Amino acid sequence: SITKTELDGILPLVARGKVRDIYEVDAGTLLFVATDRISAYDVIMENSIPEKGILLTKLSEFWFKFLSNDVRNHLVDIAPGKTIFDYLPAKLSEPKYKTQLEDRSLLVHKHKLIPLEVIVRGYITGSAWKEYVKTGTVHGLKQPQGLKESQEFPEPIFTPSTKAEHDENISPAQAAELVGEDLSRRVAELAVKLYSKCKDYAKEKGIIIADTKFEFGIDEKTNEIILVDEVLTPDSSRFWNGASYKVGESQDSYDKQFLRDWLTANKLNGVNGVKMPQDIVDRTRAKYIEAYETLTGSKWS
């Protein structure tokens, strides 16, 4: 696994997130490296999921391409026949570095981010289900009565969260407080549009995208929302098998929920330094790969 990139100062480190190591290529561009780290409940596991970051990268790329006519994205154009390494200092092609970067790195434009987790829910689960059972709303929004667990909403819904300790689910109205009324509506509508397109596509492939978290940037020069971060990965989404889908209960996970649930079941949610047993590593990895393969129609290996 590539757990922590070690680039020996060749590029400045902008950040490490839970998953990504982000370096500055230049003033406008980031080397956006998805490591193999995995986190749940905002805590990184001790051990990694080998090549998860490659999957997140590749799957993101798939979706960026799928959505390329629907939304601008943060990817830097790589000229034909070139690789990201052509756009990096030569030293990063040396194997010590290249092995840490290849297939898990995106060269992206630094964007001003819209400070929301742009969650779209097509189906009620997770935190939405928890809230709905209580008060019949999601992120404060009113809903039809009688939804059962995992049921499809009548229409997918934008249900933002803050970008945090833990992210906070907020209403669209509160999101508009944060980001502006016009922008928030644009975000909502675009997110739902993107989600729905992907949902429909995925459904035909056999996957229900229950929900997903997008991240958007804003290019204030062109007044364009930019799809940034990762897109429709099993970290950012819940993927259910359509054929096994059954409302009124939880679904099999093809996504991080498997790990989340395992941690919770084992009273390890929130605990740092958790070593996923190999079985859990493997099962998680395999679930992610299954999602990847089904969604993309391509083989992982």
Ligand X SMILES: NC(=O)c1ncn([C@@H]2O[C@H](COP(=O)(O)O)[C@@H](O)[C@H]2O)c1N
Ligand Y SMILES: Nc1ncnc2c1ncn2[C@@H]1O[C@H](COP(=O)(O)O)[C@@H](O)[C@H]1O
- Cα-flanking dihedrals φ and ψ of residue 30, to 5°? -120, 150
Binding-site size for ligand X (CB under 6 A) equals 15
The CA-based angle 191-164-116, given to 5 degrees, is 20
Q: Which pairs with CB-CB distance under 8 Å and at least 24 residues apart come from 128-134?
A: 128/159, 128/211, 131/169
Chain discontinuities in the chain, listed by preceding residue (C to N exceeding 2.5 Å): 164
User: Footprint of ligand ADP on this chain (CB under 6 A)?
Assistant: 17-20, 22, 30, 39-42, 74, 108-111, 113, 117, 161, 164, 166-167, 215, 217, 228-229, 256, 260, 270
Let me know how long the chain is. Answer: 301
| Distance of closest approach, residue 49 Cβ to ligand Y, in angstroms | 20
Beta strands in 173-278 (DSSP E): 207-219, 224-228, 237-241
Check binding of 84 to ligand Y (CB under 6 A): yes
Q: Which is nearer to ligand ADP, 10 or 113 (CB)?
A: 113
Q: Is 220 helix (H, G, I), strand (E, B) or coil?
A: coil
Cα 172 off chain centre by: 20
Cα 62 off chain centre by: 13
Q: Which listed residue (33, 45, 107, 295) binds ligand Y by CB under 6 A?
A: 107
The site partner of 61 among ligand ADP, ligand Y, ligand X, none (C-beta below 5 to 8 Å per kind) is ligand Y
Check binding of 235 to ligand X (CB under 6 A): yes
Spatial contact of 121 and 153, defined as CB atoms under 8 Å apart? yes
The site partner of 84 among ligand ADP, ligand Y, ligand X, none (C-beta below 5 to 8 Å per kind) is ligand Y
| Distance of closest approach, residue 257 Cβ to ligand Y, in angstroms | 27
| Distance of closest approach, residue 134 Cβ to ligand X, in angstroms | 14
Check binding of 226 to ligand Y (CB under 6 A): no
Build a one-symbol-per-residue string for 109-138: x at contacts with ligand X by CB under 6 A, - elsewhere.
--------x-x------xxx----------
| Distance of closest approach, residue 103 Cβ to ligand ADP, in angstroms | 17
Residue with the CB atom nearest ligand X in the bound state: 126
- Cα-flanking dihedrals φ and ψ of residue 270, to 5°? 85, -10
Residue with the CB atom nearest ligand ADP in the bound state: 17
Q: Which listed residue (59, 106, 210, 226) binds ligand Y by CB under 6 A?
A: 106
Check binding of 76 to ligand Y (CB under 6 A): yes
Q: To the nearest 5 percent, what fractions of the chain are helix, strand and coil? A: 35, 25, 40
Report the phi/psi class of residue 81: left, alpha or beta, with left for phi > 0 and alpha for psi in -120 to 50: left
The site partner of 287 among ligand Y, ligand ADP, ligand X, none (C-beta below 5 to 8 Å per kind) is none
The site partner of 113 among ligand X, ligand ADP, ligand Y, none (C-beta below 5 to 8 Å per kind) is ligand ADP
Cα 209 off chain centre by: 12
| Distance of closest approach, residue 221 Cβ to ligand Y, in angstroms | 20
What are the residues binding ligand Y (CB under 6 A)?
61, 75-76, 78, 83-84, 105-107
